[PDB]
Amino acid sequence: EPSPYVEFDRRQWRALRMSTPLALTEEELVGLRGLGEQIDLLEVEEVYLPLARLIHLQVAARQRLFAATAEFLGEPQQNPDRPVPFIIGVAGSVAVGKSTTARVLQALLARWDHHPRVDLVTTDGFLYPNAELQRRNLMHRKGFPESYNRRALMRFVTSVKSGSDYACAPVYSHLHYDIIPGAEQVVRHPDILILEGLNVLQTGPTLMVSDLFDFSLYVDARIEDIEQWYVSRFLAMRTTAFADPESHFHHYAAFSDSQAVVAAREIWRTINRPNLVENILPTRPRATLVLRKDADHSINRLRLRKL
Amino acid sequence: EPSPYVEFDRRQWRALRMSTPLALTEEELVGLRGLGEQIDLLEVEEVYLPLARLIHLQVAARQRLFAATAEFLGEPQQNPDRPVPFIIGVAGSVAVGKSTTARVLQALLARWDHHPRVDLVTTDGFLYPNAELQRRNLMHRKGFPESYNRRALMRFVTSVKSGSDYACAPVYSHLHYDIIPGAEQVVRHPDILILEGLNVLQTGPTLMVSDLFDFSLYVDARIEDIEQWYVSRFLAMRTTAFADPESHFHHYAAFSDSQAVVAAREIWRTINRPNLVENILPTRPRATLVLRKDADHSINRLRLRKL
Ligand SMILES: Nc1ncnc2c1ncn2[C@@H]1O[C@H](COP(=O)(O)OP(=O)(O)OP(=O)(O)O)[C@@H](O)[C@H]1O
Ligand SMILES: Nc1ncnc2c1ncn2[C@@H]1O[C@H](COP(=O)(O)OP(=O)(O)OP(=O)(O)O)[C@@H](O)[C@H]1O
Ligand code: NA
Ligand code: NA
């Protein structure tokens, strides 16, 4: 029976790469790869290149849609070379790899003919300050929809896509586990804006950023695996981030593999997992493209929305 | 501050009509107008013509989007003259005029160059049978999301848009207040499919028909007015539909203006109003175009989604 989707195995997907050129060194893929991630240039070749090709085919097509409305509205023509920014959403669970997926994607798309301004904005900075979360009894729901200033987030994307000269987003510090005072990321009329976060794909009683997306990615994996990835990465961070005396979680550095595992699982059980199940996963159905990962972080399956 | 929307007054909207021809007689508008509706050829000129123009501009544009994905997928070209059907959703409250709005729209779009097959499907037929509603304790929630076989509805639209040769939908009888046994509406690869219902625009934890829409209309009016329209129409039906001895509500024909008013308001209070507030109105934010009506049924304002 008919389906809005079309699935592929990596062999199948690899072939749609067609002629697409690989413009990234292995030293560059590294500065994009997050701790624990297994992405290599091969995967970028058989998976991210076709995806970049697809996206570019749609970037031009997606604008005929706006032009039409512009033609209808009698309005003049586009603004000869400052089009409606193509907005891309990247969603997925904590520790699934989306952050890397988002960075690799921005790199590939920026290295394109004529060289388009491709900005990447994570929703981290749209989290409420710890003081504000403390006030709303939310310090233990960081990552849940309500922990974000979803209104500010919407004003931001709406602004950039509505053709603004520049827009600002706050900045979150992963070292201090909090929003950075006075800091800001400025975005100037990009050609493509990539928005990455746990729920970007959420719908609601109001127009949300998921409604402004022209294309969307959802990095997926078996829930047991992600937990394994989360915990492993947690243990792994004892000698990297947590090692730093400035880290809000420096006390974790001294944990034993054993107590660190216990600590990691508890956080996952009480926070990240509930949010994945209750909020993130239910948005997967409408992702333009879903990247399914095997326990080894390898992307070997894909589901595309043809409808 | 930027907005995804752009509003118009009828004067403003009237002008976007541009050159669009009026191909409907006043005798034809009548066979489309529902009891209580005040729509006339003037309104069709200053409101429905621009709208038809807009939609046609998008019908071609919207397909460059599919072609792109087809080009990417290596797939051959479209099927030379049986394109991806353009799906249009029309939503709104009971008694707001959408049913008429939907019929007038189908008429206008069918009377177009090359003459496209424009089918209209109301979600009435996707309601569960009274026996089935009785079983789910839903006979008093007819119109609410749960009273519809939303899965069958999705299979239907998915099927038509996925390029099916033909698809079937059940048929609802307004005379018998129930689904008609063995009846079916067959839709054959339309060029445009109009889907009209109370909630068509609903989103959820799963891919829904709102997600397959290429354009959407939401007929709006002040809630107090709609109630007035509902009640008036209810009274008015004592000498038309209810007069028929076959009517499931024939007993209403004998009501006095007074007890009929009481009866009408109760139904509105307990069913239609709650559903408008809790389910329909919350979907308005994402309608491509909203037709705002003044107490006299006159459309004098419009809100278009430019984003
Ligand atoms: N305490 C931390 N210090 C630094 N980085 C952290 C910390 N916790 C999580 N991270 C994340 O590690 C990410 C890079 O790895 P990856 O790209 O695999 O992240 P992820 O899977 O999206 O996980 P997360 O949602 O925690 O970022 C950075 O984007 C950063 O947000
Ligand atoms: N008992 C009834 N008998 C016949 N038609 C009815 C009855 N109740 C409501 N209607 C509706 O009257 C509609 C035509 O008028 P209009 O186009 O104004 O309807 P509407 O505002 O959408 O109201 P409704 O949702 O009740 O159809 C028909 O589509 C039919 O569904
Ligand atoms: Na910028
Ligand atoms: Na047909």
UniProtKB/Swiss-Prot annotation, chains A, B:
Keywords of the record, alphabetical order, are: ATP-binding, Coenzyme A biosynthesis, Cytoplasm, Kinase, Nucleotide-binding, Transferase
Q: Look up the record and name the pathway of this protein.
A: Cofactor biosynthesis; coenzyme A biosynthesis; CoA from (R)-pantothenate: step 1/5
Catalysed reactions listed for this entry: (R)-pantothenate + ATP = (R)-4'-phosphopantothenate + ADP + H(+)
Q: What's one GO BP annotation on this UniProt entry? A: coenzyme A biosynthetic process
Tell me the Gene3D superfamilies matching this sequence.
P-loop containing nucleotide triphosphate hydrolases (3.40.50.300)
Q: Where found in the cell?
A: Cytoplasm
Say which domain of life the source belongs to. Bacteria
Tell me, what's a Pfam family for it? Answer: PRK
**Residues the entry annotates as binding ATP:** G92, S93, V94, A95, V96, G97, K98, S99
Name the Gene Ontology molecular function terms of this record: ATP binding; pantothenate kinase activity
Q: Which family does it belong to?
A: Belongs to the prokaryotic pantothenate kinase family.
Q: What is this protein called?
A: Pantothenate kinase
Species name: Mycobacterium tuberculosis (strain CDC 1551 / Oshkosh)
Q: What is the lineage of its organism?
A: Bacteria, Bacillati, Actinomycetota, Actinomycetes, Mycobacteriales
Gene name, per UniProt, is coaA
